Amino acid sequence: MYTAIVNLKTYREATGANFTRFMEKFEPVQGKFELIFSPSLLDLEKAAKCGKFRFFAQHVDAEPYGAYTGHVPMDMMIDLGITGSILNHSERRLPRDTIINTLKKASKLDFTIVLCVENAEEAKYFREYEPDFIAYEPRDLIGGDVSVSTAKPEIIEDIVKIYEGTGTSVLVGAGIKTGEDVRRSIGLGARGILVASGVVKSADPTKSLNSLIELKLEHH
Amino acid sequence: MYTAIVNLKTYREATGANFTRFMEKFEPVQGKFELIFSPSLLDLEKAAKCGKFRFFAQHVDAEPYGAYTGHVPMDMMIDLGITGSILNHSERRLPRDTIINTLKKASKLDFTIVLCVENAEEAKYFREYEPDFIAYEPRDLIGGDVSVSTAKPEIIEDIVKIYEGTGTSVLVGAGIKTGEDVRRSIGLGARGILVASGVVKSADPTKSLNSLIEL
Ligand SMILES: [Cl-]
Ligand SMILES: [Cl-]
């Protein structure tokens, strides 16, 4: 299957009392894409216990249970029923040694990391630590005048080439505005997408997500 | 009244399913001390809906609602029913400009900050921004061989003096092991305590806290 991740960030439409109302707009889909939502840290327990989809955290800490005021430990997430997290997003960047420590612990506990990077040097640097997914958010794909269907193909091809023959899947996390951008990304070697305001701030979130993941399949 | 804050940190005994069991058993306090609990960030929405005690966060961000992946905004806390937070704890220290931005927003929204500091220079630096509480955690009160009842009185007296006549209450957040330590702190001008493992990890948490706050 391909993978689509919808990041709720801290948007007013999809956090706090609005989390439940927002999620009622969607129904679990059986199909070629697995759908994963990323709720805010303050909503994560409610999503784990009572939500209808697979959920990943927005950020996770490597520290164990103990004297860690203001942390969100991986071992606590596992006990709530959460099986993965986004890490190093452009809005939540981390020191390199912190990222290495977290990737090493996740490998040991079979917890899934979606590691965000901004360029090919970062992508190569972290290769040997084996992230489950890489989410690519390069500056060349960010702008109102630009998208994957319009940009040079080398942007995505270079990162896919770095991870050729590893167990790591590549997702595209900038320049996704339509279904044509999604289908072109897969043609270039990506295995899915990471999206946010294009779904969350839509006048019809359900229809906006369906347009991105529609494949026009025949059934028997 | 005086104030006692019990910080749950991320201890196994008072997180997740164990949060619910811990709070079910713990008895409400009456008398001269008000109790406030500080649950982990992952437990905070559940604590707000429970409401058996007054609950403050362990850390808070100044960012509003919007595009802030992995943050815990003040405005989201307020909308859940949480009215205060600890800030700049020794385990969660912050840049000075971030602390100032947070104190200024809290003042505007009537949100209560318990600001942790480690020395008299830090205490004086933040005085003009009017924190509601100061929690003092100095190196001289940290150790298995040290406590308030055996340390020099000047340690606490200097910080009380800095905040004399302001609206800020001074709490002692290190060197508190027995009732004798609490009574000596109040004798030196403090208005309460911030404690953690001594209550949370106890075989009988209710009784351990009562032993500290009997006067
Ligand atoms: Cl523990
Ligand atoms: Cl918003």
Catalytic residue, candidates B137, B157, B164, B180: B137
Indicate the fold that domain A1-220 takes in CATH. Answer: TIM Barrel (3.20.20)
Cα B186 to averaged position of ligand 1 atoms, centre (Å): 30
Contacts of A213 (CB under 8 A, 6+ apart): A4, A29, A31, A33, A35, A179, A182
Binding site listing of A for substrate: 7-9, 142, 175, 196-197
**Single-letter residue type at A99:** I
Give the distance from residue A68's alpha carbon to the nearest chain B alpha carbon, in angstroms: 6
Burial (CB < 10 A; 0-12, 13-18, 19+), residue B204, is exposed
Q: Which run of H or of E encompasses B55?
A: strand B54-55
Structure tokens at A109: 């506990």
Q: Which run of H or of E encompasses A55?
A: strand A54-55
Q: To 10 degrees, the CA torsion angle through A27, A36, B42, A94? A: -160
- A137 part of the active site: yes
Residue with tokens 């806390």: B77
Any idea what DSSP says for residue A210? Answer: H
Q: Considering only CA atoms, which of A134, A161, A160, A166 is closest in space to residue A3? A: A134
Furthest-apart CA atoms within chain B: distance in Å: 50
- B164 part of the active site: no
Of the candidates A7, A10, A70, which has its C-beta nearest B71's C-beta? A10
B22 half-sphere exposure, CB direction, 13 A CA radius: 22
Q: How far apart are CA B147 and CA B181, in angstroms?
A: 7
Q: How was this structure obtained?
A: X-ray
- Do A119 and A138 touch, CB atoms closer than 8 A? yes
Residue A117's DSSP bridge partners are: A136
Q: Considering only CA atoms, which of A182, A174, A173, A191 is closest in space to residue A210? A: A182
Residue B121's SS3 state is helix
Binding site listing of B: 7-9, 142, 175, 196-197
Inspect the interface and report whether the beta carbons of B43 and A45 lie closer than 8 Å: yes
Q: How far apart are CA A126 and CA B211, in angstroms?
A: 52
- Do B189 and B170 touch, CB atoms closer than 8 A? yes
Which chain B residues touch A44 with a CB distance below 8 Å? 42
**Single-letter residue type at A210:** N
Q: Which run of H or of E encompasses B113?
A: strand B112-117
Q: Which residue of A has its CA nearest to B73?
A: A10
Residue A115's SS3 state is strand
Any idea what DSSP says for residue A85? Answer: E
Inspect the interface and report whether the beta carbons of A91 and B67 lie closer than 8 Å: yes
Inspect the interface and report whether the beta carbons of A41 and B42 lie closer than 8 Å: yes
Q: To 10 degrees, the CA torsion angle through A179, A184, A189, A190? A: -30
Q: How far apart are CA B79 and CA B60, in angstroms?
A: 14
| Residues of chain B that touch chain A, judged by Cβ-Cβ distance less than 8 Å | 7, 9-12, 15-16, 40-46, 58-59, 63, 65-73, 76-77, 79-80, 86, 89-92, 196-197
Cα B11 to averaged position of ligand 2 atoms, centre (Å): 33
Residue with tokens 């889909």: A29
Resolution in A: 1.9
Structure tokens at A136: 């690519």
Residue A172's SS3 state is strand
Interface size A-B, in CB pairs within 8 Å, comes to: 117
CATH 3.40.50.620 fits B1-215, yes or no: no
